[PDB]
């Protein structure tokens, strides 16, 4: 069963931080124009942080000081390299940065 990635719509005023919770290497992805994958961070650009909670299975994926260009689509995925190449991806969530 894949990880969850919530909230599905994250409404944040620009300048505030935004944190998704990924509950499941663990990658945080942003879907670009041309709908291709960009890796923002991994567990284990300074504005995209991943914090493993004491829970161990939950992770906070945070945008520090969200800008309007940060608006887009995001997800998390867990990769197992072997035996058998496997990825379990979350459903896609949207970051909606609004004007202050």
């Amino acid at each position, epitope marked *: 069963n894949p990880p969850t990635f919530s909230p599905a719509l994250l409404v944040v005023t620009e300048g505030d931080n935004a944190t998704f919770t990924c509950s499941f290497v663990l990658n945080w992805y942003r879907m670009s124009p041309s709908n291709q994958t960009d890796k923002l961070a991994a567990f284990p650009d300074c504005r995209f942080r991943v914090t493993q909670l004491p829970n161990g299975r939950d992770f906070h994926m945070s945008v520090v000081r969200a800008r309007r260009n940060d608006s887009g689509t995001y997800l998390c995925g867990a*990769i197992s*390299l*072997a*035996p058998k*190449a496997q*990825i379990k991806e979350s459903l896609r969530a949207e970051l909606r940065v609004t004007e202050r």
Partner: antibody
Amino acid sequence: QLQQSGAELVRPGASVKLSCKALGDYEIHWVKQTPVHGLEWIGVIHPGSGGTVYNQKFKGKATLTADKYSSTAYMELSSLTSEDSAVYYCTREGMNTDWYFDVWGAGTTVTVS
Amino acid sequence: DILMTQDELSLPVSLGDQASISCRSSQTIVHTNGNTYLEWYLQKPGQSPKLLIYKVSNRFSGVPDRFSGSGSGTYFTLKISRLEAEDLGVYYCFQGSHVPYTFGGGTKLEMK
């Protein structure tokens, strides 16, 4: 397709780096072939994360890397001996597929003098 | 490590004959997810290996149905009914259920 680099002619004790360009999510595997030892799985890299898993028999002998801004994977062979003279294939495994190696490179031959 | 042992090194045939290639694994090869990643590859002379059968018995896309795979536990078999010239080469079994992945030593199907 997987396009492999040209034949290598190298001396004992040296190192050589082979490349594999993916044309046209996956993991990239390397396989050695010799008449006496057959086909041997060397290891795998996931280019997106850089993660690797090695066959312990090839730890130290082979180092797998992959570029981030080109679809190229590499295998560096070190401490070369006549036992390393062989054909080396790169092959691909799709994420979340039911099978392994449906696409293979043509192989790169290494000859240790 | 799992050792994959093929029963015969060579099989001399005539075109149109039946061929059977068997492979014994030293341990069972069921992945933790329940699938058995037992595969058969054909390496035609001077070519790279090509995937014929995956998950024991499934033909890869485009592989003709004269090829069939069966087996379970530690014994797996590829059968070629009425073999054609394009079938000549070396057949290798392969397990990808447990790291490190391992291949059989090959069985060469050649003209008798």
